[PDB]
Symmetry: C2
Subunit: 234 residues, 2 copies
């Protein structure tokens, strides 16, 4: 019951299979290939969660055999955007698998996101955004952490993916091992493009301090902090 | 007596002024604008060190009034390359000032470099390279940390510059605050271009582990580790 879809048109179909693993039949992608899913609650437990991005039936790693997602209407998502629209923060304690066609995934929760032993399977790029998506005329324009002071926390059990990883938040507190092909962390109060180009920045009213502890197992690490004066402690 | 030039044609003229600050009349730049200085010993104390890159007399921050460097013959260096050619490691405990025309600076010491309260003045880019420069047909081609396991250490008193900073070593151990406009750290056993593009990498015989502790006060931080398996601990 960790994932609860919004009641409206962008709420995906969510169920649980054997062992408590959640299966999310994501909503129909738009013409850009974005499946924009809205949630009252987005949390992943140790049983994990599977996003059905499949055009044909097959075997998922975490939830066994699955049919194609009938919501897709013949075109898989290129980006699975998971947006929390309530005030509830997110806790990610297990793996998120894209079943079917590999895609990018974004979780946007302006109330906070905590990872502790979370991970991503069959995702080319996985982004955690303590912030909101920006839309113009029905198209995704980017993301915003403006006027937000909440935290992206990574716990002692770390985060693992074989793909790229983006960490976007007013501040980040990491205490475990982050394993990814590349790690990109952007801190401070910013607006971003869809590809996480920083488009604008603002000086926070108080200090927004980011703490990385633990370790980073990745060949390429980039940390960009725009909070003038605020630093990153190591 | 911390800086001792090589006796040959690339040894600069080194003296000390009031308070022990060293003044280095760097050697004539080549046609690329590289002043290639070779040293038996390169160490900077709390009184600091001034590199005379001036075409006219004026006031240095650390050593008072100085004449133009007669070695320049009317053209200032674009890059001041300081190469230790002995087996002696380097200790940097004070500020390095470029007097006159701002330039880039590189210290290359394959035996190890330790910074503790060091810094750079009037330098657009400052690089510390635990490795050797590579030359072909008399021209600088890049740098190499191949077959080297030595350490770039940054102590509790940190490192400060208002320009760009490059840290290049088989492994890095940092325990203090690094302040720079941008920080770029490349670890592992690699060959580099003159602009620190990684051109090749090799797997070390044993693990080369890099430890950043302390903090990084910079808007842009990049860490690239090519030692497959070796990570960066935070």
């Amino acid at each position: 019951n960790g994932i609860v879809p919004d009641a409206g048109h962008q709420g995906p179909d969510v169920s649980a299979v054997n062992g408590g693993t959640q299966v999310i039949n994501i909503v129909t992608p738009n013409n850009e290939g974005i499946s924009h899913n809205q949630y009252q609650d987005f949390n992943v437990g140790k049983p994990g969660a599977v996003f059905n991005n499949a055009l044909e039936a097959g075997q998922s790693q975490l939830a066994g055999h699955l049919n194609a997602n009938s919501n897709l209407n013949g075109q898989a998502a290129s980006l699975i955007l998971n947006e929390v629209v309530s005030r509830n923060p997110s806790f990610l304690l297990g793996q998120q698998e894209v079943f079917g066609i590999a895609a990018e995934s974004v979780l946007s929760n302006p109330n906070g996101i905590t990872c502790d032993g979370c991970g991503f399977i069959n995702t080319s790029r996985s982004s955690l955004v303590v912030g909101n998506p920006l839309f113009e005329n029905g198209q995704l324009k980017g993301y915003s952490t403006l006027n937000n002071t909440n935290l992206l926390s990574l716990g002692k059990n770390g985060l693992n993916t074989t793909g790229l990883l983006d960490l976007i938040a007013p501040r980040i507190d990491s205490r475990g091992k982050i394993t990814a092909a590349e790690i990109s962390a952007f801190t401070g109060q910013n607006t971003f493009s869809q590809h996480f180009d920083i488009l604008s920045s603002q000086k926070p009213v108080s200090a927004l301090d980011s703490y990385f502890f633990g370790s980073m197992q990745s060949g390429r690490i980039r940390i960009i902090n725009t909070a003038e004066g605020s630093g990153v402690k190591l």
